[PDB]
Amino acid sequence: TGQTPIVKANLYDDYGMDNFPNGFNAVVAVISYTGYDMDDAMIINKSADERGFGYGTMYKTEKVDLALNRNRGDPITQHFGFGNDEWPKEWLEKLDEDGLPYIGTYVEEGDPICAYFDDTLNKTKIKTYHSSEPAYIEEVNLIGDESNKFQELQTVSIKYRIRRTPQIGDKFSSRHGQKGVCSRKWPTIDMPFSETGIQPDIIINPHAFPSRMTIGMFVESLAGKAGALHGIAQDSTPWIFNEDDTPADYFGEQLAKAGYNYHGNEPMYSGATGEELRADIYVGVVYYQRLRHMVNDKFQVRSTGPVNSLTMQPVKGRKRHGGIRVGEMERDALIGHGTSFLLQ
Amino acid sequence: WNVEKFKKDFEVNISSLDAREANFDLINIDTSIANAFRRIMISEVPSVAAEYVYFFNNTSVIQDEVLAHRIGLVPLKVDPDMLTWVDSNLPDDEKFTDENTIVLSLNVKCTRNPDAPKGSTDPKELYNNAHVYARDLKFEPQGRQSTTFADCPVVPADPDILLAKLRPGQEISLKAHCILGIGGDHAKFSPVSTASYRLLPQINILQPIKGESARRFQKCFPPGVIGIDEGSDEAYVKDARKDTVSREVLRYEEFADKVKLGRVRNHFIFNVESAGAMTPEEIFFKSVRILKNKAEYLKNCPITQ
Amino acid sequence: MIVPVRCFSCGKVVGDKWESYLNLLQEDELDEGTALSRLGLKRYCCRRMILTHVDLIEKFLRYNPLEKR
Amino acid sequence: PGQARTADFRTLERESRFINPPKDKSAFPLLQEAVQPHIGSFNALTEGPDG
């Protein structure tokens, strides 16, 4: 679910950017409060999350093509479907009669995604699902062949759907290069709450500002709140304002006409103690982008597990219980401590 | 302090009560307790919502898990007292009973309409059942429920919620199990479209302000907050309760010297909106009761060394 | 994609309000802030949800694999 | 009025366009203009007054 930005460059309309929503209008508070939001870490409201905020999906398409081995227009060894030998039967939980998976099926690592009968083996075999992240079957396409019919099914495309609810460690950013890593999904009864009775969707820490000087975010905060109040799109094209006509004055006047504080502050109360905080806190509406994972994040742990034949040392792996490397630098550190048993 | 001293001084004022929202003040109560009620109302007052969705088919453009999610956000008009809690240690067969669970079904196929007024944009006349609404969740009573819920069918509190859209040939087919839960677990169970409070504003003037200053001063606060008295011509506070605490006064130099802005620290203006299942007052009562049981359940637990 | 059911911050149901909001802008020829008020969206929390919704689904729906174009 | 360009949400214009994709030409010429060096240069392989 994307939203149009309340604070917009007019060119956003001219390039038809609403056809590809890229973010959403969050209620953002610039507050030190949770204690988990230092070092550019940020907070997402737990209830906001549970109500759909920032939810997203990933799709992966895999091609299963059992003509991969055959030497060019060769006799066909392997056909999608089941043989009449004896094979598991649990297989039919994932797979339809054709040997293709039923659409919609939940599929986790090791499950069948494909069944064919191999002639050279006189057995019915099975391509298995490999990701450590479970998914659902979206589309299964039968890619038939040309060169005039006669040929039976040899190529299939399976598209997996992977759920991405926002997690700890997911990255978020306003449109001002203020990128943050989700530190907590903070329970809404535990968030600060406004005189207006609102809890922030996102917390960004005031200490994230004096080194970066993204003063444009502060402007967006006022403009976005004023836009949400008056039902107004706000033009944020560069160079339309100047020193004799500042946006803080302009949007501030708009907030005052609405009935809120002219500087964009709002009174808030601690979710924990219940009491009014020391000063009014800076709150408003800022368009936020959720950043895709670029990294194979997933953790790993090994007690024991597979070792390599030559050295009898832990194999490299994760997906196969590989060990973690203590390399030369960590060796030197262990010597530097004088800790010979840790080294041993 | 003393519980009787509290009883004599505590006071409630009910500004507006309605089937959906309440506005009321708790006076001379400590912030720790007002806060408790507030937290409890949001996160610990049980409600009924769809929890498990069983799909048999969905060839719409909206993905299963997403559709399931929205159904879970639909506020069901069900009295939570009419249900007992599920024990989540039993297998699925034993888990769901007529005291445990409410079953909703949904069954739509979209077909093309022949009788469409040629050159039409509206999908109501172009397609049959293009739009799927919460009201389309049919309540299927199980066992004793045919009797128990005969006097109050299960209906979403907001019938016209848009749930899904379809085009010719696409169908949705699902059953949902709806059970007791609390907001702290997942926000779909929260019975409020929000309960919060504000402290009663205190605008105290540090010397008389009259004449053209009075008119000026008066306009720094919303209409009705500041009054100008006839006679002394001086300004006075009518009702702070209408003030939004914009601190606008503090901008104009002439006044920043003559006004302090504070709060009456123990006077809470509560606003409670119900998501639709129970009335506000019920939700607030239930919270005041919930707090008391915490204290009671604890007083009766043995303290293990 | 489709109207959200509840406002992300308020919790307030908002999903019953999309089709009417369009009819307000269209038929009654109101501005956006007047129409939002008429639907009961008071907090800027909630006004934001309907004001800035993009009914992207109506685009997705034009690709229907189950009918002869 | 007759002014400089202020911002609009274009709510009705947008949603109708989603439902009724134009039958004549795209509503965002600027977007086609941005890709012009690619389409143009490829087209140059076969057009021109000289084959």
């Binding site: - | 919303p222 209409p223 209408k242 | - | -």
Partner: peptide, 24 residues
């Protein structure tokens, strides 16, 4: 240079809880 145009006809769109537009 012309200033960025003021939007005409802006009214209160916020009230303390328990009040509404026509209480003003």
């Amino acid at each position: 240079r012309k200033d960025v145009p003021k939007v005409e006809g802006l009214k209160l769109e916020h009230f303390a809880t328990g009040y509404d537009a026509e209480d003003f």
